[PDB]
Amino acid sequence: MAVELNHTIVLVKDKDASATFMADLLGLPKPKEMGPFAVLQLANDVSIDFMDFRGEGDIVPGHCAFLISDEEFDQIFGRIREGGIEHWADQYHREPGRINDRDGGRGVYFEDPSGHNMEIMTRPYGS
Amino acid sequence: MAVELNHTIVLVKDKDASATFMADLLGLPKPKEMGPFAVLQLANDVSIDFMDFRGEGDIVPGHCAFLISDEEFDQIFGRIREGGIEHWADQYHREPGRINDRDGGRGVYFEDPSGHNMEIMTRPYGS
Ligand SMILES: [Fe+2]
Ligand SMILES: [Fe+2]
């Protein structure tokens, strides 16, 4: 038996800005447009479907975390540095300009254009 | 890049109520308590990390969709029926008590205790 998470919606101020930011940074294909969504496809058969928030007022920041290889971490963190992207070792953003070494891996937090708390890491939690 | 979505937070009024509801209904392992989260583990190397969100007034409904086998659909839909769980064929909840046939599969929508728009399906979109 195998119940998979296939997609989840992330509400943002500008779906194209957030989805393209994430695809460019993570080195993924250009988001595909599907109805009101900018669809960001991840490798494990799941997508983040970015959608413009049509309520009021501020976005409540969510959290998405991405598991990547060591080689991918080097390239993606390289884009964080080269692009001047704010980043932090910790989820509460008190440790700017550092990465963490949780689980003997590497991890770092950054935000999408709407302020969601994004995270990349090379080892799963507790591994 | 082979970037995986590893976890995402879902904000709810009661993390234990929502995670237990989803795990019971979908036939998943009992949610694990990790820090402030009730962690719902899916098969494709991703978890939904339910977290208490008790400010604001109402939860702004999100959307998570789960890809399952035909046999799992039969079992999960049987639990939807047995539990008296409200369900709809469509994302806008205009078609109560129907299953949809999108992509030649089967799909249905229902809500968690906090009003998030949950979806189960037997085929990926466009397949
Ligand atoms: Fe995280
Ligand atoms: Fe959906």
What's the CA gap between B70 and A76, in Å, rounded? 38
What's the CA gap between B52 and B10, in Å, rounded? 9
Q: What is the 3-state secondary structure (H, E, C) of chain B?
A: CCCEEEEEEEEECCHHHHHHHHHHHHCCCCCEEECCEEEEEECCCEEEEEEECCCCCCCCCCEEEEECCHHHHHHHHHHHHHCCCCEECCCCCCCECCCECHHHCCEEEEECCCCCEEEEECCCCCC
Backbone torsion region of residue B54, taken as left when φ is above 0, otherwise alpha when ψ lies between -120 and 50, otherwise beta: alpha
Cβ distance B2 to A27 less than 8 Å, yes or no, reads no
C-alpha dihedral, A103 to A109 to A112 to A114, nearest 10°:
110
Experimental determination technique = X-ray
b or e along B12-28 (b: 16 or more beta carbons within 10 Å of the residue's beta carbon)?
bebbeebbbbbbebbeb
Q: Report chain A residues whose CB lies below 8 A from the CB of B7.
A: 63-65, 125
Name residue A107's beta-bridge partners: A100, A121
What's the CA gap between B19 and B25, in Å, rounded? 10
3-state class (DSSP) for residue A77: helix
Cβ distance B5 to A64 less than 8 Å, yes or no, reads yes
Could you say which DSSP state residue A95 is in? S
Cα of B7 to ligand 1 centre, how many Å? 7
Cα of B36 to ligand 2 centre, how many Å? 27
Query: Strand B4-12 relative to strand B46-52: parallel, antiparallel, unpaired?
Result: parallel
Cα of B119 to ligand 2 centre, how many Å? 6
Q: Residue B77 corresponds to which tokens in the numbers above?
A: 């839909």
What's the CA gap between A65 and B13, in Å, rounded? 22
Segments making up each domain of chain A, as ranges: 2-127
Backbone angles phi, psi at B20, to 5 degrees: -70, -40
B5: number of CA atoms within 13 Å, CB side? 32
Angle of CA points A107, A108, A113, to nearest 5°: 145
Cα–chain center distance at A3: 23
3-state class (DSSP) for residue A45: coil
Residue B101 CA: distances (Å) to CA of A5, B8, B12, B110: 19, 28, 30, 16
CA nearest to A45 within chain B: B44
Backbone angles phi, psi at A125, to 5 degrees: -55, 135
Cβ distance A42 to B4 less than 8 Å, yes or no, reads yes
| Nearest Cβ partner for A3 among B5, B56, B72 | B72
- Tell me the structure's resolution in angstroms, rounded to a single decimal: 1.7
What's the CA gap between B94 and B117, in Å, rounded? 13
C-alpha dihedral, A66 to A70 to A76 to A77, nearest 10°:
110
What's the CA gap between A80 and A91, in Å, rounded? 16
Cβ–Cβ pairs < 8 A, chains A and B: 122
The alpha carbon of residue A46 is apart from the nearest alpha carbon of chain B, in Å, by 7
